[PDB]
């Protein structure tokens, strides 16, 4: 609740960072999985090292008490890993520390207690074997969906962090597979490529927002989440990207109005892999990754730093009551060119995912 605004801001800061690099690859990550992981990590850091982290996650410490921060991440975690409820979400974070280091019990506690996360010890003396364990942890965690995540480890690595998330939720209102068919997806102003296109004619929470200069579609997932798709007008993609804000999103989530439209949405599966040291570094989080790292909350007498941090986010979208639709020409809304999207957990309103699809068949 209290940290939602901060998470929404971190999501935009990260997205805009990634968007500046490439403009051809499909951006896709979990602001929530990344933030939760480093907020947890900060519990083992002090002073500068500790503040760069929370500030890197868009938390102004001069205004928000640390207790409120961790408290927010904890209520959010309860929601995501609720036994009784749906969502069909698989995520996790793994901390791998060198054996031989004397860990501080308290840290290990809060990790497995407050953030209900996992901490492991490994022999980094054997680099190939260490990343095999790490990768097996991820693979096993994602039922084999995410394999060989970590490709390398420098030799002096004594602490590594892996954060993964896989989502394949079902729509509240399904698509007809028999209606799904190959269509052109415009990757350029004059170039096209074929992709499987799901389609449906019905009452949709959809509208053309003029401030974003793009179509905005909201669709509910089974459970407590909602997907938001933004289709920018010809040449308005980056205008869209710069205009996005938390309030604008909140507004869309408030609207309940539906209307008829023939929708064409691509059936796809996209992934996103990022080097957090490189990416979060550009966000000011560099201390915890340096030799000057103050991680006395993790190990007391020996020097320590986080030498490896990786994030992987995977999303699958497919076809997955009686409506009333008027017999008037409905708008045909085709997501057959680059678009942006957001996944919002309904309870906390936090941004579960965020990405851009420039090429579904990439």
Author numbering: 24 to 343, 352 to 393
Excerpt from the paper describing this PDB structure:
The 2.2 Å crystal structure of Thr114Phe α1-antitrypsin adopts the classic structure of a serpin fold in the native conformation. The polypeptide chain spanning residues 24–393 is highly ordered with the exception of residues 344–351. The root-mean-square deviation (r.m.s.d.) of the mutant and wild-type structures, based on Cα positions, is 0.4 Å. The lack of perturbation elsewhere in the overall structure of Thr114Phe α1-antitrypsin implies that the mutation must be mediating its effect on the fold stability of native α1-antitrypsin from within the cavity flanking β-sheet A. The cavity is well defined in this high-resolution structure, permitting interpretation of the effect of the mutation on cavity filling at the side-chain level. Phe114 makes no interactions with nearby residues, and therefore, its effects are entirely due to partial filling of the cavity and changes in its packing environment during unfolding and polymerisation. The aromatic group of Phe114 closes the upper part of the cavity with its side chain just 3.7 Å from Leu103 and 4.0 Å from Asn104 at the top of helix D, distances that permit favourable van der Waals contacts. The volume partially filling the cavity in Thr114Phe α1-antitrypsin is in a region of high-solvent accessibility in the wild-type protein and also yields the therapeutically desirable combination of effective blockade of polymerisation whilst maintaining inhibitory function. The estimated size of this ideal pharmacophore is 59 Å3, equivalent to 22% of the total cavity volume in wild-type α1-antitrypsin. In order for α1-antitrypsin to adopt either M⁎ conformation, residue 114 must move laterally by 4.6 Å in the plane of β-sheet A. This is limited by local steric clashes in Thr114Phe α1-antitrypsin. The high-resolution structural characterisation of the Thr114Phe mutation presents a more precise pharmacophore target for screening of small fragments capable of mimicking its effects.
The plasma protein α1-antitrypsin is principally synthesised by hepatocytes and protects lung tissue from degradation by inhibiting neutrophil elastase. It is the archetypal member of the serpin (serine protease inhibitor) superfamily of proteins. In common with other inhibitory serpins, the native fold of α1-antitrypsin is metastable and this property is utilised in the characteristic serpin mechanism of action.
